[PDB]
Structures are given as C-alpha cells and as structure tokens.
Write an enzyme that holds these catalytic residues in place. Structure first.
Site, mmCIF file in Angstrom:
data_model
loop_
_atom_site.group_PDB
_atom_site.id
_atom_site.type_symbol
_atom_site.label_atom_id
_atom_site.label_comp_id
_atom_site.label_asym_id
_atom_site.label_seq_id
_atom_site.Cartn_x
_atom_site.Cartn_y
_atom_site.Cartn_z
ATOM 1 N N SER A 1 0.802 -1.227 0.000
ATOM 2 C CA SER A 1 0.000 0.000 0.000
ATOM 3 C C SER A 1 0.838 1.284 0.000
ATOM 4 O O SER A 1 0.899 2.008 -1.008
ATOM 5 C CB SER A 1 -0.950 -0.006 1.211
ATOM 6 O OG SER A 1 -1.975 -0.999 1.089
ATOM 7 N N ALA B 1 -11.190 -11.285 12.805
ATOM 8 C CA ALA B 1 -11.903 -12.493 13.216
ATOM 9 C C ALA B 1 -13.401 -12.390 12.933
ATOM 10 O O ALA B 1 -14.026 -13.358 12.480
ATOM 11 C CB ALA B 1 -11.654 -12.764 14.703
ATOM 12 N N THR C 1 -0.657 -6.586 1.573
ATOM 13 C CA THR C 1 -1.667 -7.352 2.302
ATOM 14 C C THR C 1 -3.088 -7.024 1.826
ATOM 15 O O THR C 1 -3.900 -7.932 1.587
ATOM 16 C CB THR C 1 -1.528 -7.103 3.809
ATOM 17 O OG1 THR C 1 -0.328 -7.710 4.301
ATOM 18 C CG2 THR C 1 -2.700 -7.707 4.560
ATOM 19 N N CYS C 2 -3.408 -5.730 1.690
ATOM 20 C CA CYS C 2 -4.773 -5.328 1.352
ATOM 21 C C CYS C 2 -5.201 -5.941 0.025
ATOM 22 O O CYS C 2 -6.236 -6.612 -0.059
ATOM 23 C CB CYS C 2 -4.874 -3.797 1.304
ATOM 24 S SG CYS C 2 -6.545 -3.136 0.901
ATOM 25 N N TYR D 1 -11.356 -7.290 14.388
ATOM 26 C CA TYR D 1 -12.213 -7.091 13.230
ATOM 27 C C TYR D 1 -11.897 -8.117 12.140
ATOM 28 O O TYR D 1 -12.785 -8.502 11.374
ATOM 29 C CB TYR D 1 -12.078 -5.649 12.726
ATOM 30 C CG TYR D 1 -10.818 -5.338 11.942
ATOM 31 C CD1 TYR D 1 -10.764 -5.574 10.570
ATOM 32 C CD2 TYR D 1 -9.703 -4.771 12.554
ATOM 33 C CE1 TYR D 1 -9.623 -5.285 9.823
ATOM 34 C CE2 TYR D 1 -8.545 -4.472 11.813
ATOM 35 C CZ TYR D 1 -8.521 -4.739 10.446
ATOM 36 O OH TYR D 1 -7.412 -4.471 9.672
ATOM 37 N N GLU E 1 -29.814 10.056 6.693
ATOM 38 C CA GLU E 1 -30.517 11.271 7.108
ATOM 39 C C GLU E 1 -30.886 11.266 8.587
ATOM 40 O O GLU E 1 -31.119 12.338 9.151
ATOM 41 C CB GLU E 1 -31.783 11.515 6.260
ATOM 42 C CG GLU E 1 -32.973 10.568 6.491
ATOM 43 C CD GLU E 1 -34.219 10.913 5.617
ATOM 44 O OE1 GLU E 1 -34.629 12.108 5.565
ATOM 45 O OE2 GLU E 1 -34.803 9.981 5.002
ATOM 46 N N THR F 1 7.476 -2.427 5.063
ATOM 47 C CA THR F 1 7.402 -3.875 4.904
ATOM 48 C C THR F 1 6.219 -4.533 5.619
ATOM 49 O O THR F 1 6.016 -5.737 5.440
ATOM 50 C CB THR F 1 8.710 -4.510 5.385
ATOM 51 O OG1 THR F 1 9.059 -3.958 6.660
ATOM 52 C CG2 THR F 1 9.831 -4.228 4.385
ATOM 53 N N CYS G 1 -8.151 -6.159 2.527
ATOM 54 C CA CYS G 1 -9.400 -5.449 2.257
ATOM 55 C C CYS G 1 -10.091 -5.935 0.987
ATOM 56 O O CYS G 1 -11.326 -6.025 0.940
ATOM 57 C CB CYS G 1 -9.152 -3.943 2.156
ATOM 58 S SG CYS G 1 -7.528 -3.412 2.675
ATOM 59 N N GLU H 1 -15.127 -10.334 10.792
ATOM 60 C CA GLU H 1 -15.500 -10.226 9.385
ATOM 61 C C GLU H 1 -15.480 -11.596 8.695
ATOM 62 O O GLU H 1 -16.425 -11.958 7.975
ATOM 63 C CB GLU H 1 -14.575 -9.230 8.688
ATOM 64 C CG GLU H 1 -14.782 -7.787 9.157
ATOM 65 C CD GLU H 1 -13.747 -6.807 8.607
ATOM 66 O OE1 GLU H 1 -12.597 -7.230 8.315
ATOM 67 O OE2 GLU H 1 -14.100 -5.610 8.471
ATOM 68 N N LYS I 1 -11.403 -9.809 1.308
ATOM 69 C CA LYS I 1 -12.416 -9.971 2.350
ATOM 70 C C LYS I 1 -13.694 -9.218 1.994
ATOM 71 O O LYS I 1 -14.801 -9.724 2.234
ATOM 72 C CB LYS I 1 -11.892 -9.547 3.731
ATOM 73 C CG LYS I 1 -11.707 -8.069 3.959
ATOM 74 C CD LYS I 1 -12.329 -7.662 5.274
ATOM 75 C CE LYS I 1 -12.146 -6.177 5.539
ATOM 76 N NZ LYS I 1 -13.022 -5.501 4.566
ATOM 77 N N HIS J 1 -33.960 12.128 1.605
ATOM 78 C CA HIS J 1 -35.033 11.179 1.881
ATOM 79 C C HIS J 1 -35.402 10.412 0.617
ATOM 80 O O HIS J 1 -35.606 11.031 -0.443
ATOM 81 C CB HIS J 1 -36.275 11.921 2.431
ATOM 82 C CG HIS J 1 -37.403 11.021 2.856
ATOM 83 N ND1 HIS J 1 -37.310 10.145 3.922
ATOM 84 C CD2 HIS J 1 -38.669 10.901 2.381
ATOM 85 C CE1 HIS J 1 -38.459 9.507 4.064
ATOM 86 N NE2 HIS J 1 -39.302 9.952 3.144
ATOM 87 N N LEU K 1 -4.138 1.322 8.615
ATOM 88 C CA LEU K 1 -5.135 1.274 7.550
ATOM 89 C C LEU K 1 -4.460 1.505 6.208
ATOM 90 O O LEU K 1 -3.412 2.143 6.123
ATOM 91 C CB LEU K 1 -6.240 2.332 7.749
ATOM 92 C CG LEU K 1 -6.999 2.271 9.081
ATOM 93 C CD1 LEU K 1 -7.691 3.604 9.424
ATOM 94 C CD2 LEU K 1 -8.007 1.132 9.055
#
Ligand code: FAD
Ligand code: FAD
Ligand code: A7N
Ligand code: A7N
Lengths: 588, 588
Positions: free
Chosen positions: B112, B293, B148-149, B291, B571, B252, B154, B295, B157, B566, B436
């Site tokens: 990333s 585990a 990794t992502c 998170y 909202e 890394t 990300c 997800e 998954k 709406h 992140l």
C-alpha cells in the site's frame, strides 16, 4: 431587542412558564402542571445569556420581576402562590382552556409539512386541529393520511426502485458462486404492490395513532380559508360548517398535471395511480423528463417492462446537464427507449382496461418531433409526468388577502409568514423553496417552535442535497457546473473529477468507466466547494454526510486532508486531483 | 524561515526547476527537458506568497537572482543558455544521471504505502527502485505484487463479504415479488474463490505495469538495510548483492501471529491462507476477537458454514464497546456461535487435508474457560486471528541505528523520519499510527512530495474514520463514548442516539430496532462532535462524508441546520434529539 422578542413570545405562546432550573417554587409549579395534564412551553432564564434582561422585561406584562411566571394566550396568570390557589380551587382547568377561538392552530393539509407542524405545536400546549382530504384522481384512485410522499411519492417509489435493484443482485449472485439461474426467474407485479401497499397502510395507521397520542384533533374533511381566522370544512356527507383558529398553517401540497390534449385525462395515468395499480403496466410510454419520469421508467424496465420515454427537450431540467446526460445514457444502455425532441398530440383508446382478468387496455399515441416528422405507436399504459401544480383556488378565498405569485404558490418572508400576519405557508406551496419532504418537515417543526415556544431559529433553505433514484443513482449538493460558471466566470472555476468502479462490480463483470464524480470549486475563495456531484450506487448515502461539510464552507484542502475509508465508492472524493482544464482523462 | 526551506528543497530534490509561468525562457527550458524525456519537479515563483523572497535566496547556491534555475541533486546546473548548451553538446543526459548513489530512492516493501511512495517519487525525476518479496505461510501459501490489502486483506475480504450479503438479497427478492426460492439455492466456494483470485491477479499485473510506465525498477527480492545507504538483496536463486540509495523508505508491513501452543502452526490456518483456500472450510473455529476475526466468521456463516468464535475477553478491544456488543449480538442471532471467556490449549490432528478430493481435514481443539471449566470439540478448519506484528530483524540490521519500540515498531517524528536521518518508515510499521491502507497511501505520497518536490504538507493522523464489515456493518469517526467521558468527565459529555430501520427492510420483514447511531458531544465546547458511530447497511458510505465535517470541527448545531436526503439511512443523523441523560428510549 430583548424586549421585542419577549413581547412576540408572550403574545402567541399558548401556555408558557418562565422559570429557573434552580428554583424549587418553579419545580412546584412544574409538578402541578402536568399532574393536571397541562402541556406547556418552558423557558429557563438561568440558561440564556440575557436572562436578567428578560426577567426585567417580564414586569411590563405582570408587574413582578421574579420566577415562576405563568402565561396563557398572552395574559399573565400568576406566580407560584396564585397557580396553586387556582389548582386547589378547581379553577385551573378552565383558565388554561379559555380562548377567543376553538383552536390555537389549524393546519390545512395532512402531509409531510402539516403533520410535522401539528405534532410539534401540540407538545407546547397549543390546541391543534389537522385537516386532510384526498381528492380522487380521474379514475377514482384515493388513499389515506400522510400526504404525497408517504402514499404516492418517495416511499412507494423507492421500494419499487429496490425491487428493480434486486434484479441485478440476482445476476450478480451467479458470479459470486450462488447456484441460481437468473434467466429462469420472473417478477410478479401485483405481489410487489400488495407488499408496498401493506407498508403504506401501516404508515396511514401510525400517523393517526400519533395525532391521537398528542391530543391533536384529526378531521378527514376538505378545508377552505374564508377569513383570517375562519376555516370552512366539508365532511364526507357534504355537511358544511366553520371553525376558528388563532394561527393558520397552509400545507396542502400539489397534484400531477395533464397536457391539454385529447385522450390524456380519459386514457392516461399519473404517478398518483401508478403505485397501487392492480395490473402490470406492460408496454408503457412515459411522457416527460423530470426525476419522477425517469425514476418510474427506470424501475419499470428493471422489472421486465418494454418502456419508452418521450422527451420534449432535455432530461432533468434544472440539474447539472453533464450529470443528467450520463444518467440518460446509462438507462438507454440497459433497455430504456427514448423518443427525443418529441411531444404528444392525442391518445386514442383501442381497448378498455380489463378490470376482470387484471390486464391493461391498449392505446394509440400520436405525436410529432420538433422538425415536423411524425410519431405513431401503440402502448398499453401511458404515464404523464409533466410537472405538478397546486390549486389554492380550492383552499383559499381571494378576499382573505393572501398573495400568490404567477405559478399560484404563496409568497412568504423567510419566517414562512404570508401577507396575512396570522397565516403561514410551508412545503411545496411555499414559493421559491426546494420541493422536498425533509424541507417541509424541518420548516414545519421550526415554525411551531417560534409560534408557541419562543424559539428564533429559521429554516435554512440553501445548499440542500438531493438524490435522483434512477437505476444508477445520482446525488448532488450545491451548484451545477454551468451555474457556477454563469455566476463567477470560467476563469474563477476549477473542476476536479474522476471515473470509478465499485469493488462489487469487479467480480460481477459490470462496467469499468460509467460511475463518475466531480467537485466544482471557486479559485479566488480558497478553492471553496461550490457543488458536489456523484453518479453511482447508494448515491444518497454517499452524498448526505458531505452536505454537513458544505454547509460549513468546505474547501478542496478540507477534502484532501481527510483520509478515506477503504474499500468504498465514497472514498474517491478524498483523493481527487485531475482537473478539467488540464484535459487529462478521468478514466481508470 | 524561507531560507531553511530552500536549503532543504535544493539538497533533497533530484531534478528541480525554479520557474515563472510568464517567462518564455522558462517555457523554452521546460520544452527541452520534455523532449529529452527528463522528469523533474517545478516551482512557479509567480504563484507563491514569498516567491520574490525565494528568488533572492536562490543566489546563495547559484550566484544569480533570475529565472529559470535548474538544479540536479543539490548542485546548480545553469540558466537557459547553459542548459541549451549542454543539450546542443549532447552533455545533458550524463549531467542529470550522475549521482553518488545507485538510486535516489529505495523502497523496501511493495504494498500500500510502498507502491504509492515509489510512484509519486518517480514523477519528479527521482531514480527509484521498489523491492518486494512474499515469505510463504507455514503451509506454503504465496501471492503477488501489491501488499496485504490487495492480496490477503481489504480486497478479498470485502468481495467475500459481498457474497454473504447476496444471500439476504436472494431472500429479500421473494418479498419484492421475484419468483425464486431461496430454500433451494446453495453456494459453491471454489467458484467464488476463482472470481476473487482473478480480480486480484489483474491487480498484481496492473501494479507491475504501473511501475514500468513510471520507469521504476521492480526487484522481486528480499531486501535488508545493512548501513544508512546500503541495501542487500537476495533473489529467487539466493544470489546476494548490494545496491545503494540516497533516501530509503521502509514499508514492509506485518504478518499474522500464532499462539504458543501445540499444533497451532501445524494444523491451523490464518487469514493469509483463507482467501485462496482450494476447499470450503466446513465447520470452522475462529480464535480471536479482532475485526479480522469477526469479518471472516461473518461471511463464512452467511455462505452456509457452521461457524464458532472463541473470545478470550471482549469483542473489538479498543473500539466503542456499546457498538461492539451490538455487532456481536447481531452475529449471534444470525448464526454465529460464541464461546465466551475461552482460550485454546492445543490443536490435535484427526484427519489430514484431503488434497485429492478437495476437502478439509479434521481437528480436535482443547482449551479452558476463564472460571476453570473445559472446552473440547472437533472442527474441520481452525483459523487464528489473534493479532499481527512486524519482524524488522529480517529487514533491518540492529547496527544501522534505527530506534524501535517495545512492540518492534519504528519510532519516527511527525514527518516519518527515523533516527537515521535519510531513512523513513511508513504504514503499519510506523509506531502509534492507525494501521489502515488509505493512511499508508497518504503517508507515502505526501512523504515523496516533501523529499523530491519541495512540499511541506504533513499527513494528518487524527480522527481517521473506519468501518468494520461484519454482516451488519459498523462505521465510526473519532472517540468512543468511554474514551470521551474518561478525558473530559461525564458531566461535560452529551450523547444523542436513535435506532432506525432501513426502508429496504420494511417489505422484506426484517428487524425493527437493530440499526443504531449516536453522536458523542462536548457540552462546554459548543457541543462539538467528538465521535460519530453507526451500525447498519452501507456503513462505510454513510460515514465517509461526515469525516470531512469532523475534520473541520462540526458541532451538533451544524448537524441540525443541515437538511436530510429522503429516503436514506444517513438522514437520521440530521434530526437526532434523544439524549442518553434523559432516559427516553431510542426505539422507533
Ligand atoms: C412521485 C413522487 C416522488 C417523490 N419522491 C421524493 C423523494 O424521494 N424525496 C423527496 O424529498 N421528495 C420526494 N417527492 C416530493 C415530496 O412528495 C414532497 O416534497 C412532499 O410531499 C411535500 O409535502 P407537503 O407537506 O408540501 O404536501 P403533501 O405531502 O402533498 O400533503 C398535502 C396534503 O394536503 C391535502 N389537501 C389538499 N387540499 C386540501 C384541503 N382543501 N383540505 C384538506 N387537505 C387538503 C392533500 O390531499 C395532501 O394529502 C416526490 C414527489 C412525487 C410526486
Ligand atoms: C485480513 C485483513 C483485512 C484488512 N482489511 C482492511 C480494510 O478493509 N481496510 C483498511 O484500510 N485496511 C485493512 N487492512 C489493513 C491494511 O491492509 C494494512 O494496513 C496495509 O495493507 C498495510 O500497508 P503497508 O504498505 O504498511 O504493508 P503491506 O501491505 O503488508 O505491504 C508490505 C509488503 O512488503 C513485503 N516485504 C516484507 N518484508 C520484505 C523484505 N525484506 N523485502 C521485500 N519485501 C518485503 C511484504 O511481503 C508485503 O508485500 C486489513 C488487513 C488484514 C490483515
Ligand atoms: C412580513 C409580513 O409578511 C409578508 C409576506 C410577503 C411580503 C411580500 C414579499 N409579498 C411582505 C410581507
Ligand atoms: C527527525 C528524526 O529525528 C528523530 C528524533 C527522535 C526520534 C525518537 C526516538 N525520539 C525519532 C526521530
């Protein structure tokens, strides 16, 4: 300054208590008040910056300067000792219900605005009546309490949109490993309509429960203002009478328009009938190009219909025209036919609606294109979406003195006040305002607080986000690109933009460069964001949050320094960099 | 002030041109560099606040005050006439290409932040190499360029989350009138993995293409910093050599931890292995409570697996615990089973992975509850998700002098600089920064602009929004409720909250009071929004926009005066009014 506010607050408040949060005599009066089930507004002077000034000003009405002080309809009632004396002498109930009129507030029209106004006002002790009647459509279609959005507007329209969105989810499912065959699956229209109508029914019922639990009187009757304080009502048996109210709120909405051509009223339909149609429309012609027109033509196609839209001039007049044209191209690529620069001349009936076996009739539509050439084609259903209009002639006597503009909408100041000082207007009939349900709701609740609770906050009508719910949704907040250029000049406008593809569309093999978003900015004002625009799934959920930032004056740098959430479509807004002037491509 | 900036810019840039947009001698030089395909940064003095001051300061290096001035690697090269002389004499290319080091920038880690930093740097003329190598998992799993992502985070998954979401879409469609039968539909794991892996493969390949089209050297070899400017590389034949670079960026990342118990490494898997598993996991045990585990357990259950989660102590430690509990309670109602206050003691093998017929093995998991009781049960797969860690001893020699912290993470100043002045660290190995993918990307691009283009903007790590993609999603921005109270005291914190029901859930007959949101505000700072929390569908799209208002310091009043869209879930944030202090229920 402070004194003029107090004078206005005391004059129109129905029941109001001036108080301090620390005082035990105040608490003693509060306790007696709702034990006797008396609702009222309360103003805690120890929580305002100029309370000592108000406390002084109160003596102009009461001759005293202490707290608590209780007022009913602009008249001082007493301090602690005096209220308690009225209670234990059984005099308090008649004091609070004494009134020149039957109602502190009459609301004409039981829709988004008027229901919100009524409920809010009743919570501060205003004696409130809400009137709603639903004139039938040409074919006789009728519905219950709640207004245009609840019954024949936002709510059924979005649920029908969702049934159409589920079409592509069934396709997408195969690629994600689910065993179904989308090609062997069909949609049952009447089964959808029953489920949509069952929800609408439970909104009809909720709102009736809500008025009863707030002690609002609900009259299912037609209302007509004949003088500043007099409303004439006609019930279901055509019995006529008169009721009086101190304040009047007009909130009677609009209804669909029909073009002045033969066959239209007799054989076509509007959105008022579409959402409870007992049969599937079948081969359908939609005449118009508003958001109503495109939303309805949109989900009809996703459900399996053969659908055509006849466009007089442009799509979504009043919205950014690049965005509108992208919306249109997406629809044309997924089944919707367009007859461009074309207007209808007459509808002829070839078959009457088969009310028994649950089927549409059949019609012949004849028109012309703007260059003379002819239009002639058969359809089963013709839906007219060529605008909406009010008809205050049926609500309001001209001798009352409320002023209207050219279009027939009420002319108000920015506090919703009409030219008759005790009469206000909210919602779609308030001239110049965005015609949206959250606006009607907000305008109605803030008006009720100013009238009956001493509030001062006005409704802010600028930069109100919208979303068009076409098969690919389009959300926006602020100026269109062409309006920004008209107002400031092309040299002072900078546009950042990018295409994108949602991660969900990858495995499903959907389109690479169809979704799009742009930021329209002002160079000489720290690159202020003048408008936001996004075409893509969930566009309403994407846009909403940014409306708070725009209301706050956000710049491009505010968007740059905020970090994105990954993976989402919405994060594309946080790393935008390609300008339109640079001529770099926005594709990915 | 200005002087120390110009010194820093000149010493660090690789090829930089000081210019003015109005000067034809500048345009002349820009053209010659473009034609010779020489990449470089530019600073247009006629668009800077103190550009007149900078012009004077340039004389410290060049002995001239005029425009243009071209530098290479700290050294002044010439004005217009001198540059054209080098060009006309075929001397320019060896002047721009001469360097004390092999590269201006060596990035260790091709994920990333790593790729983002390398691409940005190359755009301003810096000669760049990116190193990436993927050490296999214990059972041999390996993947391609991207981090990794892209390969095990990300991207895979969230695609598997989307396949789980489609199971409820198939159910819902019957209610909206579609003729399918969800009861007779099943899921094929291998088909879904093939679609996911194909999209990943197109990302692997896109990244390599992007490095080539930016003239970046990509080395699929393991890198090791042995001295400030010396990087040792070991290729796929275990050949060893050395390259040198001026600036170095460590990027890394981390890999998953295993608990120190018998059988775990031998017979369990982790998220590294799960996204390319050739066989469905079957009855699965997930150990941990992150998170990661929740997800994975969430989508396994949605695709028909029999899933259990073992929780040492609490769910989502570090997140708002009210929301964590609402998250898990939903998962528990919809299938996932939980063994609370439990830890594993050993994993014993009963069947081996059947690699022929594409089938899992069989394990026996033994462990104990916190009170003392005993856990014993058989599972076909066991997934460890008990945290992640770096291992910089593989990457960075302890003699170089880069300070680490007690967790093995790199200590930096607020501009990513380590304790060795020419070496920086970005992404998950930067101590104390949110871990992140968009953070790492912002850190990388912004760092490359400070090193090679004269920029000053730092990365802002505060109030970064998140989203947990459990089967009901959870999005947040800013402080948890417990963190906000602890910091300012309960008396100074007000919390507005409410339940809601998506309109899509009405006709589908889904739950009424499960979705939830709250705003956590500081009374004595004008009701500033300290944290925002929402549990519901499309939580990422909902939350993104509000992070821009929170970066700008929004108050409750800012939310109030903004109008809603709406019908949307989002909202509900524009009309919040029930407070926790009041005791009024938040149900609808
Ligand atoms: C097809 C369609 C889709 C829409 N979709 C959206 C959307 O997604 N989002 C959005 O924000 N807006 C949407 N709108 C707009 C929304 O419906 C309106 O802005 C909203 O209804 C405004 O309400 P109102 O309070 O002004 O009046 P209304 O809701 O129209 O209520 C007025 C009521 O007063 C009644 N009435 C009239 N005369 C009398 C009388 N003399 N006595 C008693 N009662 C009377 C009317 O019959 C009506 O029930 C849509 C509109 C349409 C037509
Ligand atoms: C299961 C999971 C789900 C996630 N989901 C999300 C999500 O939805 N949203 C989000 O924002 N974040 C998510 N994350 C976190 C996010 O993926 C990471 O924060 C991010 O990928 C880290 O970026 P990086 O550049 O620091 O490291 P990485 O992406 O790990 O890249 C580092 C690379 O360097 C390589 N490398 C290591 N040592 C060497 C060496 N000596 N020589 C050469 N190369 C080497 C590694 O093998 C790897 O390829 C998730 C993480 C996991 C584990
Ligand atoms: C403030 C009293 O209300 C008014 C309403 C409308 C107008 C003008 C604009 N037609 C003037 C006064
Ligand atoms: C500018 C780089 O300087 C540094 C100074 C200090 C630290 C930590 C160890 N205190 C890290 C980097």
């Amino acid at each position: 300054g402070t004194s003029q506010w107090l004078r206005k607050t005391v004059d129109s408040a129905a029941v109001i208590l001036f108080s301090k949060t620390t005082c035990p005599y105040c608490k003693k009066v509060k306790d007696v008040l709702a034990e006797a089930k008396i609702k009222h507004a309360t103003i805690e002077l120890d929580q305002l910056s100029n309370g000592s000034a108000i406390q002084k000003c109160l003596a102009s009405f009461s001759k005293i300067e202490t707290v608590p002080q209780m007022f009913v309809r602009g008249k001082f009632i007493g301090d602690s000792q005096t209220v308690l004396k009225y209670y234990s002498n059984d005099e308090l109930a008649g004091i609070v219900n004494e009134s020149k009129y039957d109602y502190d507030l009459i609301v004409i029209g039981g829709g988004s605005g008027g229901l919100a106004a009524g409920k809010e006002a009743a919570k501060y002790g205003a004696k409130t009546a809400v009137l709603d009647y639903v004139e039938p459509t040409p074919i006789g279609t009728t519905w219950g309490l709640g207004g245009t959005c609840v019954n024949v507007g936002c709510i059924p329209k979005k649920l029908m949109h969702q049934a159409g969105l589920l079409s592509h989810a069934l396709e997408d499912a195969e690629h994600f490993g689910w065993s179904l065959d989308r090609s062997k699956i069909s949609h049952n229209w009447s089964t959808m309509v029953e489920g949509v109508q069952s929800h609408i029914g439970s909104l009809n019922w909720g709102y009736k429960v809500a008025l009863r639990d707030n002690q609002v009187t609900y009259l299912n009757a037609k209302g007509r203002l004949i003088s500043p304080h007099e409303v004439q009502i006609t019930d279901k048996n055509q019995k006529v009478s008169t009721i009086t109210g101190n304040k009047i709120i007009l909130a009677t909405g609009e209804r669909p328009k029909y073009p002045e051509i033969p066959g239209a009223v007799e054989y076509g339909i509007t959105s008022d009938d579409l959402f409870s149609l007992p049969y599937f429309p079948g081969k359908t012609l939609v005449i118009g190009a508003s958001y109503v027109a495109l939303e309805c033509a949109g989900f009809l196609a996703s459900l399996g219909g053969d659908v055509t839209v006849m466009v007089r001039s442009i799509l979504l007049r009043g919205f950014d025209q690049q965005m509108a044209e992208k919306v249109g191209d997406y629809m044309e690529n997924h089944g919707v036919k367009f007859a461009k620069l074309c207007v209808p001349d007459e509808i002829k009936q070839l078959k009457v609606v088969d009310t028994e076996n649950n089927k549409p009739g059949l019609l012949l539509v004849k028109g012309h294109y703007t260059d003379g050439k002819k239009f002639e084609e058969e359809f089963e259903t013709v839906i007219f979406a060529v605008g909406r209009e009010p008809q205050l002639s049926k609500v309001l006597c001209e001798t009352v003195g409320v002023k209207l503009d050219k279009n027939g909408r009420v002319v108000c100041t920015d506090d919703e006040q009409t030219t008759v000082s005790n009469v206000y207007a909210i919602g779609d009939i308030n001239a110049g305002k965005p015609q949206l349900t959250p606006v009607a709701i907000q305008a109605g609740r803030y008006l009720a607080r100013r009238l009956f609770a001493g509030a001062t906050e006005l409704t802010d009508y600028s930069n109100v986000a919208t979303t068009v719910f076409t098969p690919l949704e389009y959300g926006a907040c602020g100026l269109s690109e062409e309006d920004a250029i008209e107002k400031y000049g092309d040299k002072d406008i900078e546009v950042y933009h990018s295409n994108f593809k949602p991660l969900e569309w990858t495995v499903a093999h959907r389109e690479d460069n169809v979704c799009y978003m742009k930021l329209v900015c002002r160079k000489s004002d720290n690159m202020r964001v003048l408008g936001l625009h996004v075409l893509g799934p969930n566009a309403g959920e994407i846009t909403q949050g940014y409306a708070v930032a725009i209301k706050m004056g956000a710049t491009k740098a505010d968007f740059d320094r905020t970090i994105g959430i990954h993976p989402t479509c919405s994060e594309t807004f946080t790393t935008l960099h390609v300008t339109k002037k640079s001529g770099v491509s926005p594709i990915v």
